[PDB]
Design a protein around this ligand. Structure first.
Ligand code: NA
Ligand code: NA
Ligand code: NA
Ligand code: NA
Ligand code: NA
Ligand code: NA
Ligand code: NA
Ligand code: NA
Ligand code: NA
Ligand code: NA
Ligand code: NA
Ligand code: NA
Ligand code: NA
Ligand code: NA
Ligand code: NA
Length: 488
């Protein structure tokens, strides 16, 4: 919808007109930068811990950290569900830090009239509007219910399945301040249920994603008054507004539009160190969940979810659900279509400055440390010598570690049995740590011939680290055979 037309002006005595004019000039005289009134200044990252590598079990873990910035301007103000009833169209508030904190100070002044309008489908330009004489919380909310009932009784049958408007937001979690810049200060209230494990993520132990899923059934907006004084009761004066703290530092604003519906907050989590977790998470949410590829399928199998649901029930019931990632798409399924039983709750709203009816935007900036990890599984080299000859092996590799300042240290390693004559039947296993790379496997056999005493059987270089590399040699002095096979 576009904003509806203003109601007719209320009758005023000469001094009431004078007071209204004084209010107009006072508000119009308020000097401030609208682009800098509402701000959230997040964390400042002073330093980034160096890259480190360590061994844990059958794996080697590499943990990297990078400084990131989230800089974002939001026009949609988030709603803390517990105090959602305080959010209603036409409400007068101060535009300050408390609005950024998602608990704005409401101006306790008497009100004049306003026109509310709803964007439900099918309604005429006369049906979607209603005049509220005294714009209190009770009167506005009753007016909202009146509009909703009017739609249910004239147009509902003509529109059975009108899909909700989807407002979707997702982020890999790293810090509270980061997510506050993305999901508003209201995230803190939600996080009292979700409990994002920032500590474990910072240690590279787990990866978590936070999702905000809004299903908006309808929006109710308010007329934009041509005069700042139009929203105030005829008994309100400039002096009263000043005493209440309405000034250049705390500019007056009004809630121009409120989104009603159902909201689902999600906390996806896994212990996987894979770099495909995001893509895996994306698939488990969209229904694109393709079990054709087993890397994404494996992450999903070992991933869980926690869901906080608002406005998904008849009243103001709050649902909390835990489970496995594969069991989603059931929660996200419900609520896609608005119906009479589930009317929806306030979940978002926009604000306009009273001075020029300009849109109030929250300016967010936050720095955070992004922690990414990498897991390298240990491996074995299995040697089997069953040839009718004397054999000598030469097996080497590099092990990569990190100094205290994050720089790589490459140590060359040699098998203890290198250059030693071995008779069949010889078997041995070389245990390679996760940080081992560039595996070299060499083997020669003594032929006993004067022109060719030693004969090379194997000379494979720069081999990748696998779980089980089986090196076998057999045959005779004239006909040596070998195999270099993986994982079998
Ligand atoms: Na981010
Ligand atoms: Na309300
Ligand atoms: Na007053
Ligand atoms: Na009033
Ligand atoms: Na009010
Ligand atoms: Na997003
Ligand atoms: Na933080
Ligand atoms: Na949010
Ligand atoms: Na914010
Ligand atoms: Na929090
Ligand atoms: Na809650
Ligand atoms: Na996702
Ligand atoms: Na302004
Ligand atoms: Na991570
Ligand atoms: Na490395």
């Amino acid at each position: 919808m576009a904003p509806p037309a203003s109601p007719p002006a209320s009758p005023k005595t000469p001094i009431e007109k004078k007071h209204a004019d004084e209010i107009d000039k006072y508000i119009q005289g308020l000097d401030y930068n609208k682009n800098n009134v509402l701000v959230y200044h997040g964390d400042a990252v002073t330093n980034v811990p160096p890259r480190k590598g360590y061994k844990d079990g059958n794996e080697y873990i590499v943990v990297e950290k990078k400084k990131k910035s989230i800089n974002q301007n939001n026009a949609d103000i988030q709603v803390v569900n517990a105090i959602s009833s305080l959010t209603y169209p036409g409400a007068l508030v101060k535009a300050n830090s408390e609005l950024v904190e998602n608990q704005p100070d409401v101006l306790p002044v008497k009100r004049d009239s306003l026109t509310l309008s709803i964007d439900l489908p099918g309604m005429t330009n006369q049906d979607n509007k209603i005049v509220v004489k005294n714009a209190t919380k009770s009167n506005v909310n009753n007016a909202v219910n009146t509009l909703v009932e009017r739609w249910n009784e004239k147009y509902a049958q003509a529109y059975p399945n009108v899909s909700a408007k989807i407002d979707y937001d997702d982020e890999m979690a790293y810090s509270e301040s980061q997510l506050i810049a993305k999901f508003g200060t209201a995230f803190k209230a939600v996080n009292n249920s979700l409990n994002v494990n920032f500590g474990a993520i910072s240690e590279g132990k787990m990866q978590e994603e936070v999702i905000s899923f809004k299903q908006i059934y309808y929006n109710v907006n308010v007329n934009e008054p041509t005069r700042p004084s139009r929203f105030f009761g005829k008994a309100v004066t400039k002096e009263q507004l000043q005493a209440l703290g309405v000034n250049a530092e705390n500019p007056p604003a009004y809630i121009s539009s409120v989104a009603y519906g159902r909201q689902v907050y999600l906390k996806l989590s896994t212990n996987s160190h894979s770099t495909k977790v995001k893509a895996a998470f994306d698939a488990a949410v969209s229904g694109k969940s393709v079990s054709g590829d087993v890397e994404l399928t494996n992450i999903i199998k070992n991933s869980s979810f926690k869901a906080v649901i608002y406005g998904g029930s008849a009243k103001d019931e709050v649902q909390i659900i835990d489970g496995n990632l594969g069991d989603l798409r059931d929660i996200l399924k419900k609520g896609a279509t608005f119906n009479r039983e589930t009317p929806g709750v306030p979940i978002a709203y926009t604000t306009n400055f009273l001075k020029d009816n300009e849109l109030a935007v929250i300016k967010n900036n936050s720095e955070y440390i992004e922690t990414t990890s990498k897991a390298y599984t240990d491996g074995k080299i299995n040697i089997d010598h069953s040839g009718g000859y004397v054999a000598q092996f030469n097996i080497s590799w590099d092990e990569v570690n990190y100094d205290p300042e994050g720089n790589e240290i490459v140590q060359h390693k040699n098998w203890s049995e290198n250059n030693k004559s071995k008779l069949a039947h010889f078997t041995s296993s070389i245990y390679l740590p996760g940080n081992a790379r560039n595996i070299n496997v060499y083997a020669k056999e003594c032929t006993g011939l004067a022109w060719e005493w030693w004969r090379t059987v194997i000379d494979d270089r720069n081999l990748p680290l696998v779980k089980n590399r089986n090196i076998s040699i057999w045959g005779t002095t004239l006909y040596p055979k070998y195999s270099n096979k993986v994982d079998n």
